[PDB]
Amino acid sequence: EIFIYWSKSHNFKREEQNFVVQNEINNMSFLTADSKSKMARRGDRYSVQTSLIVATLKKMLPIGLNMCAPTDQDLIMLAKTRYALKDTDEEVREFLQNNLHLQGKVEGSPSLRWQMALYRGLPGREED
């Protein structure tokens, strides 16, 4: 939700680098500090890739995608399409209720079958 606000508020983007340039934020120590502890120019001042919001997102993303079942990615890409049509959170929730039965099938693809095995085999996955 923080990244949603960042992605939508243009002034938040605009004064993000203003805070960066005024504080001389390197943005590399916040990611490579453990690399130095592990003994291991172009974007020297500011870049979108060095932002801490997405820097946190790339680490959170496997965790967030872990909860979602393998039958729901097909809903994710069509959700990307309807989100591209600028549908709010309430609207996309209603569209999910409009197409709940359009989710993936276990025998619909051999790629999904092993995904069910390695997803449902976790102790924390409850069938209810």
Binding site: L31, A40, P62, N66, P110, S111, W114, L118
Partner: protein, 903 residues
């Protein structure tokens, strides 16, 4: 003409790690004896007869790779000249079975005894069946390399190794002068039975790919120290010639005082009350000044190594004292420390390494001297037989004795350091023990071409059991087998021995692993990215980049590839079973990646770079070597000229090259009992065939070999000479001597071009081309050579049904090197009748397109079988020894190439 197919049983070989060999000043005794006990043998478990052979083999080329190969597969002992085998009826050598007379000859039946006698003082390998001698012995065989026991067996056998002493009792009396083979075990290792150099061993979770096994060498049993004679003794050393001797006159005596070995005035050293701590003046004078000049000898070793001394600080003589301890108190002329006492003094690692090699150079001089007095090695000590368990070079010695030697001289160098005199390390020179066989170091493992992927995101694991030079990554389908990964664009690999990434070079990336780590490689053909994950953690380059490689073209595709160095173990987990993956959920599962073999039934066909030389035709696009086919004119016969394209230029390729023709000549099935125009009545009946080679001007004949090779020649030596030619003579006779059948067999039939040149004062670059000719008589098996139209002294005789390939071994030293001439002479038939049946009565020589010149590629690709023979090996007990069992059958259908005689 047509390739033949047949069902062939899988054959594996099992050896004990008992290695023996001879060399100049060798520390290994050259006479040995062992036995093989046959428990159960199935005569026919499958359609092919059960294979079971016993004999010796050579450590530097006997590589019976499972699957197809020489002849009709199932290669074991005796199928090539790197091994000699006996199976109860034949003395197998050079893939030829020769019957031998025995007292009741038969195949290796259950409840049988096979005794092997090895002599290295003279070349001889004797055999005994059930104690009855075998009337046939190998002689005149190569000594280079090491000889070890080995049994080659198909499925359905139970054999036991009788090694005598503790691992058996030999059930018989070994011949005099022949020692039991169990005495040859090196002290650092324990006796065990392992197969020959392999590429796969089973593991708890899966097959472990195995990098080349490091092999011990005969040259590693000769102790070669640095000579300590031509050293003028320096003034600063004679100045300290005394204290460094006084401190080592009873240092070995200090430990045992005030114990059961406590000295007494009535006796002296070596009388179970040794110490005598008083002084060395009381001790005998010759060993006394001997100990002084042994301290000097250690200082001379320091000089020859590169150690020099310098005095800076306060003299230790002042601030040192002798401590009359309550321990080591004696009644004989007062009490004192047995060596000269010393206070707090330390030693840096340079001194540790230096004292290590100083003890090495002491041990190797002692061993050299003992050998010069005749002594040798035996794991059990025999003083009247003059054998010791410690007559091996220091590098092969045991850690107990290493520490015991190093302790005394560590005290000595410590006492030297106390006086402030510097121990100067010498210069560092990097050296490699083995350099020639650069190919028996990397064994590239990859998948079959049909598994090539050109899309999607893929994942696989590679558990690094060891932490050596092992590379894992992705490679293109046309990856060369004899080139290390990363040298070209055909590899995108991460070398994690020290944390480097390799693609058209090498640059640092990530961190090296440790034992047990799992390297999860990525590939993303959609995003054109390659990532390497170590223990579930994404590796980093020397920047903030998360991807090892980027902007990679799709190309022909990529394959999961890995390679292993010598003595390395790596488990490859391509992903056939998803549960077997360790870090897939941690990295790969949540980011759209999939296992490489996620939906497959059979295991992925994995191809390994087979490091055994084979003969293949020259590529037409070869930048260095080209072969030109010159048409036969009115006066010149057809020729195959070899010219070096890039000779005499920068970055050229200059190395020993082996050349051969693509077609053989087979000798007759039965040998016969007991102007300038060819006469038609006799040229149609002659059995003599002649070919010649033109050594061009500027090409030195000193590095030219000309002759014939049998199709089992796989000897790629860059420093090749006639000594390395494999050969063996098998002599057969009656029960009491009477050698009546002395058969000489060899794979390489070469002559030296340096013996065919007139030794003038100067002008070795002859303006006239050297035309060496070769004549072979198929009806008799006798073959000779002509220097310049005149016959030479050298000749060879071969057995019937033998195949010879026209070969020339040469080191290129000119723009034009050689030229294969398919000519003919007076009443001599050209090769067109000795290679083509349809051209048997065609006198005019021709060069048909099938005949073409071939190189000797060192490494060629091969396929690892989806199943391997299950061998049960264990120690049955003290009385029996080690038992080998194999019952599960495995059969392969092999396509056999007739002319090359290989399947």
């Amino acid at each position: 003409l047509l390739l033949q197919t047949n069902l062939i049983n899988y054959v594996t070989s099992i050896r004990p790690n008992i290695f023996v060999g001879r060399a100049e000043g060798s520390t290994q005794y050259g006479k040995w004896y062992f036995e093989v006990m046959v428990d159960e043998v199935v005569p026919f478990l499958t359609a092919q007869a059960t294979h079971l052979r016993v004999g010796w083999a050579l450590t530097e080329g006997y590589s019976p790779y499972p699957g197809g190969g020489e002849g009709w597969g199932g290669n074991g002992v005796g199928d090539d000249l790197y091994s000699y085998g006996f199976d109860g009826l034949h003395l197998w050598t050079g893939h030829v079975a020769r019957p031998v007379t025995s007292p009741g000859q038969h195949l290796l039946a259950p409840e049988d005894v096979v005794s092997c006698c090895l002599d290295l003082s003279v070349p001889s390998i004797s055999f005994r069946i059930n104690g009855c001698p075998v009337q046939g012995v190998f002689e005149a065989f190569n000594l280079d390399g090491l000889f070890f026991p080995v049994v080659s067996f198909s499925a359905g056998v139970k054999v036991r190794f009788l090694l005598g002493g503790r691992h058996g009792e030999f059930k018989f009396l070994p011949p005099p002068g022949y020692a039991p083979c169990h005495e040859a075990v090196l002290p650092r290792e324990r006796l065990r039975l392992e197969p020959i150099k392999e590429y796969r061993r089973e593991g708890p979770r899966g097959p472990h790919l195995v990098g080349p096994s490091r092999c011990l060498s005969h040259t590693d049993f000769v102790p070669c120290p640095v000579d300590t004679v031509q050293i003028v003794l320096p003034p600063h050393l004679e100045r300290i010639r005394e204290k460094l001797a006084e401190n080592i006159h009873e240092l070995w005596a200090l430990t045992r005082i005030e114990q059961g070995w406590t000295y007494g005035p009535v006796r002296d050293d070596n009388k179970r009350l040794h110490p005598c701590l008083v002084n060395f003046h009381s001790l005998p004078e010759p060993e006394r000044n001997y100990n002084l000049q042994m301290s000097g000898e250690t200082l001379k070793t320091l000089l020859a190594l590169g150690c020099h001394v310098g005095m800076a600080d306060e003299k230790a003589e002042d601030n040192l004292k002798k401590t009359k301890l309550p321990k080591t108190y004696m009644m004989s002329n007062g009490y004192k420390p047995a060596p000269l006492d010393l206070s707090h003094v330390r030693l840096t690692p340079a001194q540790t390494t230096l004292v290590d090699r100083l003890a090495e150079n002491g041990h190797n001089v002692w061993a050299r001297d003992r050998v010069a007095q005749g002594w040798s090695y035996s794991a059990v000590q025999d003083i009247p037989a003059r054998r010791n368990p410690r007559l091996v070079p220091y590098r092969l010695l045991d850690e107990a004795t290493k520490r015991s030697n190093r302790d005394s001289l560590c005290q000595a160098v410590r006492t030297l350091l106390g006086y402030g005199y510097n121990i100067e390390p010498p210069d560092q020179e990097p050296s490699q023990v083995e350099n020639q066989s650069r190919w028996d170091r990397v064994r590239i493992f990859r998948a079959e071409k049909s598994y090539t992927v050109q899309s999607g995101r893929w994942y696989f694991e590679f558990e690094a059991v060891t932490t050596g030079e092992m590379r894992v990554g992705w490679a293109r389908p046309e990856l060369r087998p004899d080139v290390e990964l990363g040298a070209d664009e055909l590899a995108y690999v991460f070398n994690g021995h020290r944390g480097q990434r390799w693609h058209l070079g090498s640059e640092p990336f990530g961190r090296p692993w440790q034992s047990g780590d799992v390297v999860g490689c990525m590939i993303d053909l959609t995003e054109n990215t390659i990532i390497f994950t170590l223990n579930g953690e994404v590796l980093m380059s020397d920047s903030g980049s998360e991807t090892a490689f980027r902007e990679i073209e799709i190309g022909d595709g990529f394959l999961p590839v890995c390679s292993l160095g010598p003595g390395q173990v790596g488990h490859l987990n391509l992903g056939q079973d998803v549960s077997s993956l360790r870090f897939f959920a941690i990295c790969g599962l949540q980011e759209g990646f999939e296992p490489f073999a996620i939906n497959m039934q059979r295991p992925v066909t994995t191809w390994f770079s087979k490091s055994l030389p084979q003969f293949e035709p020259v590529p037409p696009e070869h930048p260095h070597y080209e072969v030109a086919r010159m048409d036969g004119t009115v006066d010149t016969p057809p020729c195959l000229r070899l010219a070096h394209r890039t000779w005499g230029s920068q970055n050229s390729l200059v190395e020993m090259l082996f050349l051969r023709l693509s077609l053989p000549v087979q000798f007759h099935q039965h040998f016969r009992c007991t102007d300038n125009r060819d006469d038609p009545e006799i040229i149609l009946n002659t059995t003599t065939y002649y070919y010649s080679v033109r050594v061009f001007a500027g090409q030195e004949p000193s590095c030219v070999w000309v002759g014939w090779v049998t199709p089992d020649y796989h000897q790629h030596d860059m420093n090749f000479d006639l000594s390395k030619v494999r050969a063996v003579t098998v002599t057969m006779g009656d029960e009491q001597g009477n050698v009546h059948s002395s058969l000489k067999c060899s794979n390489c039939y070469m002559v030296w071009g340096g013996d065919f040149v007139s030794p003038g004062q100067q002008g070795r670059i002859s303006h006239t081309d050297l035309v060496i000719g070769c004549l072979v008589d198929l009806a008799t098996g006798l073959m000779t050579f002509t220097a310049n139209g005149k016959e030479s002294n050298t000749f060879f005789q071969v057995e019937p049904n033998t195949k010879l390939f026209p070969a020339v071994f040469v080191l290129p030293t000119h723009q034009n090197v050689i030229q294969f001439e398919l000519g003919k002479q007076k009443n001599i038939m050209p090769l067109s009748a000795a290679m083509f049946l349809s051209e048997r009565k065609n006198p005019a020589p021709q060069c048909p397109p099938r005949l073409e010149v071939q190189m000797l590629m060192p490494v060629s690709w091969s396929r690892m079988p989806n199943h391997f023979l299950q061998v049960e090996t264990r120690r049955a007990g003290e009385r029996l020894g080690w038992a080998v069992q194999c019952q599960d059958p495995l059969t392969m259908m092999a396509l056999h190439i007739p002319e090359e005689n290989r399947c």
